[PDB]
Amino acid sequence: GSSGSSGSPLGQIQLTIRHSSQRNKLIVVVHACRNLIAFSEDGSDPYVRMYLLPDKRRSGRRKTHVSKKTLNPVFDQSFDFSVSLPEVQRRTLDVAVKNSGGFLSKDKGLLGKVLVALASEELAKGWTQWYDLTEDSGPSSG
């Protein structure tokens, strides 16, 4: 280990995950994000991306609105996906918050991303917490 940054400079995000066994669906609410560094003070366009791993098909892509001229975007929206617990369990919810600044850049510019394990049993009830975004460097157990 090496001494470096102290805290979560990339940013964080709060998502309420709750999978009902009766409805066999996966509900995910995107309250809002904070501490989202901008590639340029001028203004960045932060946005949350939700993907049901492993499947990454570019068809079921479910994301929230893209706020402009702001670092702390707010959507407070709620999504849903018809998936049985048996599956969602061995699956993962790829949640990455990048900036849609495709203007004179030619890159996605990853600001921050965090993975969540839906292999929990306390999903029916649901929980709320701030997932501290981290760098790409990480295991992809899809």
Burial class for 93, CB neighbours closer than 10 Å (0-12, 13-18, 19+): buried
CATH number at residue 59: 2.60.40.150
Task: Indicate which technique resolved this structure.
Answer: NMR
Residues forming a β-bridge with 95? 50, 114
Q: Which domain holds residue 28?
A: 1-142
**Count of domains observed in the chain:** 1
